[PDB]
Amino acid sequence: ATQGQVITCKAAVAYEPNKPLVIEDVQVAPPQAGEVRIKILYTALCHTDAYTWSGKDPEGLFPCILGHEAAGIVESVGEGVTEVQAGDHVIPCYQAECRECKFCKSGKTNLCGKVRSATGVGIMMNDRKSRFSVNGKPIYHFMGTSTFSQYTVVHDVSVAKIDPTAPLDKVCLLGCGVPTGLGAVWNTAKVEPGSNVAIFGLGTVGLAVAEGAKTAGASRIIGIDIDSKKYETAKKFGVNEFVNPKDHDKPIQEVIVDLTDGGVDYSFECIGNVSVMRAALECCHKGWGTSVIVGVAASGQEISTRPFQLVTGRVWKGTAFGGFKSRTQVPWLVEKYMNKEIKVDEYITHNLTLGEINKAFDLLHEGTCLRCVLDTSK
Amino acid sequence: ATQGQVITCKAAVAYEPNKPLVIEDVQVAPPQAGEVRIKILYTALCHTDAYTWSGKDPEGLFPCILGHEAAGIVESVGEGVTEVQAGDHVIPCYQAECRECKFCKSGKTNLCGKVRSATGVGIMMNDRKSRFSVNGKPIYHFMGTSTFSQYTVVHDVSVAKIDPTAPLDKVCLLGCGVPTGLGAVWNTAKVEPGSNVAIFGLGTVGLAVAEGAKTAGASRIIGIDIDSKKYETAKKFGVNEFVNPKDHDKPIQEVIVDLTDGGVDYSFECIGNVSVMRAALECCHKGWGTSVIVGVAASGQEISTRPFQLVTGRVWKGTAFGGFKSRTQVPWLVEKYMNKEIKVDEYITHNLTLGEINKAFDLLHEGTCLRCVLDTSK
Numbered sequence: 001a002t003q004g005q006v007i008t009c010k011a012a013v014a015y016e017p018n019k020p021l022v023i024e025d026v027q028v029a030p031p032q033a034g035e036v037r038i039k040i041l042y043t044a045l046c047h048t049d050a051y052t053w054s055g056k057d058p059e060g061l062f063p064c065i066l067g068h069e070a071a072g073i074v075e076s077v078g079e080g081v082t083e084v085q086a087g088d089h090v091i092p093c094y095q096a097e098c099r100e101c102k103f104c105k106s107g108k109t110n111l112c113g114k115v116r117s118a119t120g121v122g123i124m125m126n127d128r129k130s131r132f133s134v135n136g137k138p139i140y141h142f143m144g145t146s147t148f149s150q151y152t153v154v155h156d157v158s159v160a161k162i163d164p165t166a167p168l169d170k171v172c173l174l175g176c177g178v179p180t181g182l183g184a185v186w187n188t189a190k191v192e193p194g195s196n197v198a199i200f201g202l203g204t205v206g207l208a209v210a211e212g213a214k215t216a217g218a219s220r221i222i223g224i225d226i227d228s229k230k231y232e233t234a235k236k237f238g239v240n241e242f243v244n245p246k247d248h249d250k251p252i253q254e255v256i257v258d259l260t261d262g263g264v265d266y267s268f269e270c271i272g273n274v275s276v277m278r279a280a281l282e283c284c285h286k287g288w289g290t291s292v293i294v295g296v297a298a299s300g301q302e303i304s305t306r307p308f309q310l311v312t313g314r315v316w317k318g319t320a321f322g323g324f325k326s327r328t329q330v331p332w333l334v335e336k337y338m339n340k341e342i343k344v345d346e347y348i349t350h351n352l353t354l355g356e357i358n359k360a361f362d363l364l365h366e367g368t369c370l371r372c373v374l375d376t377s378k
Numbered sequence: 379a380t381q382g383q384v385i386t387c388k389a390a391v392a393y394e395p396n397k398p399l400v401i402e403d404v405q406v407a408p409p410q411a412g413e414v415r416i417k418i419l420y421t422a423l424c425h426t427d428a429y430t431w432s433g434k435d436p437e438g439l440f441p442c443i444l445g446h447e448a449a450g451i452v453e454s455v456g457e458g459v460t461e462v463q464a465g466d467h468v469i470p471c472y473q474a475e476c477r478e479c480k481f482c483k484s485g486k487t488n489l490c491g492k493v494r495s496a497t498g499v500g501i502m503m504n505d506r507k508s509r510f511s512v513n514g515k516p517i518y519h520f521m522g523t524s525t526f527s528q529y530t531v532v533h534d535v536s537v538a539k540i541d542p543t544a545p546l547d548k549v550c551l552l553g554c555g556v557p558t559g560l561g562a563v564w565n566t567a568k569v570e571p572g573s574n575v576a577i578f579g580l581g582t583v584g585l586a587v588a589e590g591a592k593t594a595g596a597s598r599i600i601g602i603d604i605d606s607k608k609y610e611t612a613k614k615f616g617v618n619e620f621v622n623p624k625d626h627d628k629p630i631q632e633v634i635v636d637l638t639d640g641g642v643d644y645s646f647e648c649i650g651n652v653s654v655m656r657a658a659l660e661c662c663h664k665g666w667g668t669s670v671i672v673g674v675a676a677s678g679q680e681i682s683t684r685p686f687q688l689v690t691g692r693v694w695k696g697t698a699f700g701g702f703k704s705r706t707q708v709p710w711l712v713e714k715y716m717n718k719e720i721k722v723d724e725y726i727t728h729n730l731t732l733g734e735i736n737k738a739f740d741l742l743h744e745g746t747c748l749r750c751v752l753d754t755s756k
C-alpha cells in the first residue's frame with residue numbers, strides 16, 4: 001500500500017515567475033475527507049499554465065505545482081468519498097460540480113462555488129493547507145488540480161470518472177480547451193444547423209469551436225487569426241473561410257459584415273483581447289446575432305460597444321468551460337471521443353515527458369503547439 | 379407571346395382511380411389575379427400522388443392532374459403578382475405562405491390557410507374554377523400544384539423563387555419529402571448534438587430525417603424498417619444502426635429501449651401507421667424523450683398510448699412540411715444544396731419522362747424508387 005502514507009514523487013515546481021521549472025522530489029500527503037489522490041499519467045499544458053508561470057496572474061501563488069489538463073488513475077480516496085475509488089480512471093477538473101450548492105441546484109449554470117475558496121488560494125478545503133511539500137515546506141496547489149506531477153490530490157467534487165478503456169494520453173485534453181470550445185457552440189450559443197459563424201482566434205479553443213460548429217451543422221465557418229498559417233491547420237477542424245485582419249485596413253468587424261452581407265449568426269472570441277471581443281460582437285447580424293466570449297481578458301481590461309448594437313438585436317454572452325458540468329459531462333465527452341464523434345487526437349501536436357517540461361513551455365511560447373502532452377513517468 | 383393566351387400542352391390526366399394515366403393535350407388558361415403560370419421542366423412523384431391515384435384519398439377529385447414535386451420557369455403572372463416574374467426559376471409548393479393570415483403572422487407555425495379552401499377542392503381562389511380542360515371540360519387541380527404537366531397555374535402565395543443556376547432536375551425534390559425530413563429534425567424536434575434518434579421508415583422522408591439528424595450532430599441514428607435492404611442504402615444518409623421489427627418477437631419499442639438502455643432522445647415516424655407511431659412514442663426515453671409524427675395516417679385511424687408515457691416526460695408532436703415556411707425557406711434549402719450542405723441528388727434513383735409516367739408509377743408501386751424524376755419535354 002501507498003494508501004494512508006505520504007508518497008514521494010516527481011513534480012514540476014514553479015518557484016518564481018519566469019524561472020525554469022525545477023523537477024523536484026516532492027511529498028504528496030494522503031487524502032483527507034472528501035479528497036482523491038490521483039496517479040497522473042499524462043498532462044497537457046496550455047497558456048493558462050504559462051500565464052500564471054510568467055507572473056501575470058493576480059491569483060498566482062509561489063511556490064506552486066501548475067497543470068490542470070490531465071488524466072490518471074485514482075491511487076486512493078479519503079473519508080467519505082464514494083463516487084470514485086482506487087483504480088478508477090479519472091480526469092481532474094478545475095471546475096467542480098458539487099451538485100448541492102444553489103448554483104448546481106439552479107439548473108441554469110455549470111458554475112459551482114463549493115471549493116473555489118480553497119482552490120483559488122492553492123490549498124484544500126478540509127484543513128486549509130496544501131498536500132504538497134519539499135523539505136518540509138508547503139507548495140501551493142494550482143486551480144484545484146496541480147497536474148504537473150506524478151501524483152496530485154484534488155477535491156472529489158472535481159473528479160470526473162471516465163471510461164476505463166479510454167487512452168489517457170489523449171483524453172487529458174477533455175479537462176480544458178476542447179470542452180470549452182465544443183460547449184461554447186452546443187450549450188452557450190446552441191448553434192442551429194445552417195448558421196453562419198465567425199471564430200476569432202484559431203488555437204485549440206477556436207479550433208474546438210470550429211469542430212463544435214461543424215458538428216452542429218453550421219454553414220459558413222469563418223476563422224479570423226493574425227497568423228495565416230493557422231488556416232491550413234484549421235480546415236480539418238471545420239473552418240472553411242479565413243480572414244487575417246492584417247490584410248485589411250478596415251476594422252475586422254466591417255470586413256466580416258461585408259463578407260456575409262450583414263454579419264454572422266454567431267461569433268466566438270477565443271483570444272482574450274477586449275478589442276477583438278468588441279469586433280466579434282459588432283460582426284454579428286442585426287436582429288438576431290449572438291457573440292460568445294470564450295477568451296479570458298487580463299485584469300482591469302474592459303469590453304465596450306455602443307448600446308445600439310444590443311438595442312438592434314445582438315446578444316452578448318460568454319462561456320465558462322463550455323457550459324459543461326464537469327463530473328457529469330466530461331465522462332460523456334469521453335464516450336463521444338471513444339465513438340469517434342469528437343476529435344481529440346488531432347489537437348496534440350507534440351508529446352514530451354514531464355522531465356522535458358521546460359522544453360514544452362518553450363514550444364508553447366513560440367506558438368508551435370496546439371496541445372503538447374507530457375508523459376509523467378520520465 | 380404565350381402570355382394572356384391559352385396554352386395547349388402535354389399533361390398526365392387521371393380520369394379514374396387505378397386506371398392508367400392518359401397523356402392528353404390539355405388547355406391551360408392564362409393566370410388571373412394573384413396567379414402564376416409555370417413551365418414545369420421536371421416533376422418527381424411520390425406515394426402522395428399514388429395514394430390519390432389509387433382512389434383512397436377522401437379529398438381526391440376526378441378527373442385531375444396530379445403531381446406536387448416540381449421545378450420550372452415562370453411563363454407569366456397574373457394581375458397584381460410582384461414576387462416572381464416571367465423567367466424566374468421556381469418551385470411550386472403544396473404549402474402556401476401568404477404572410478398575411480393569423481397563422482403566418484403568429485410566428486409560431488408554418489401552416490397558412492390562405493388558399494386551402496380552393497386548393498383542397500381542385501380549383502383556384504380567384505374564380506373558384508380550374509385552369510385545366512380537355513375538349514372544353516374542366517380538369518381539377520391537385521394540392522394547389524398539378525405538376526404532371528408541361529404547364530401549371532398556381533397561387534402566387536405557393537411559389538418559391540429560387541437560385542436561377544440550380545439544376546431543375548434535382549431541386550424538384552425540395553417541394554415535399556426532403557424538407558419535411560430535414561425540418562422534422564431542425565425545426566420541429568430541434569435535435570441537439572449528441573442526441574440519440576430512432577427513425578421508423580426509411581423511405582425518402584426517413585432518409586431526409588437521417589440526413590437532418592446527421593447534420594445536427596446526432597450520435598446513434600437507429601433506422602427501423604420492415605425491408606432489410608433499406609439499411610445498406612440508408613447508411614449514406616447517416617443511419618448507423620438498424621433493426622427490422624420482423625427479426626424480433628418483442629414489440630419494436632421494447633427492442634429499441636433495450637438497445638439504448640432506456641430509449642432514444644428523439645424518434646420520428648416516417649410511415650403513416652398508427653401502431654408504429656405509438657411504438658415510436660414508447661421507445662423514447664423517460665423524462666425527456668420526444669417523438670415526432672411525420673407519417674400521414676389514413677382517415678379515421680387513431681394513435682394511442684397510456685397517459686403515463688406523457689406524464690413521465692415524453693412529448694408527442696408532429697410536423698407539416700418540416701416546419702418550413704415554403705416561400706421564404708425553400709429558396710434557403712436550394713442555397714444549402716448548391717453549397718453542398720444538403721443532399722438532394724442521392725435520393726433520385728431513376729429518371730424517366732412524363733410520357734413514361736405510368737411506368738414511373740409501376741416503379742413507385744414495387745418499392746424500387748426513392749424518388750423517380752420525370753422530364754416533362756418528352
Ligand SMILES: NC(=O)C1=CN([C@@H]2O[C@H](COP(=O)(O)OP(=O)(O)OC[C@H]3O[C@@H](n4cnc5c(N)ncnc54)[C@H](O)[C@@H]3O)[C@@H](O)[C@H]2O)C=CC1
Nearest residue numbers: 180201202203204205225226270271272294295296320321
Ligand atoms: N472560458 C473558458 O472557460 C476558457 C477560456 N480559455 C481562453 O481561451 C482563449 C484561447 O485559448 P487557446 O486556444 O489555448 O489559446 P492560443 O494562444 O492557443 O490561441 C490564440 C490564438 O489567437 C490568435 N490571435 C491573437 N491575437 C489575435 C487577433 N488580434 N486577432 C485574431 N487572432 C488573434 C493567435 O494567432 C492564436 O492562434 C484564452 O484566452 C484562454 O484563456 C481557455 C479555456 C477555457
Ligand SMILES: NC(=O)C1=CN([C@@H]2O[C@H](COP(=O)(O)OP(=O)(O)OC[C@H]3O[C@@H](n4cnc5c(N)ncnc54)[C@H](O)[C@@H]3O)[C@@H](O)[C@H]2O)C=CC1
Nearest residue numbers: 558579580581582583603604648649650672673674698699
Ligand atoms: N408530414 C408531412 O408534411 C409529410 C408527410 N409525408 C408522409 O411521410 C411518410 C413517408 O413517405 P415516403 O418516405 O415518401 O414513403 P415511402 O413509402 O417511400 O417509405 C415508407 C417506408 O416505411 C417502411 N415501412 C412500412 N411499414 C413499416 C413498419 N411497419 N415498420 C417499419 N418500417 C415500415 C417501408 O419499408 C418504407 O421504407 C408517408 O406517410 C407520407 O405521407 C410525406 C411528405 C410530407
Ligand SMILES: [Zn+2]
Nearest residue numbers: 046048069176
Ligand atoms: Zn488549459
Ligand SMILES: [Zn+2]
Nearest residue numbers: 098101104112
Ligand atoms: Zn456546486
Ligand SMILES: [Zn+2]
Nearest residue numbers: 424426447554
Ligand atoms: Zn411528395
Ligand SMILES: [Zn+2]
Nearest residue numbers: 476479482490
Ligand atoms: Zn398565410
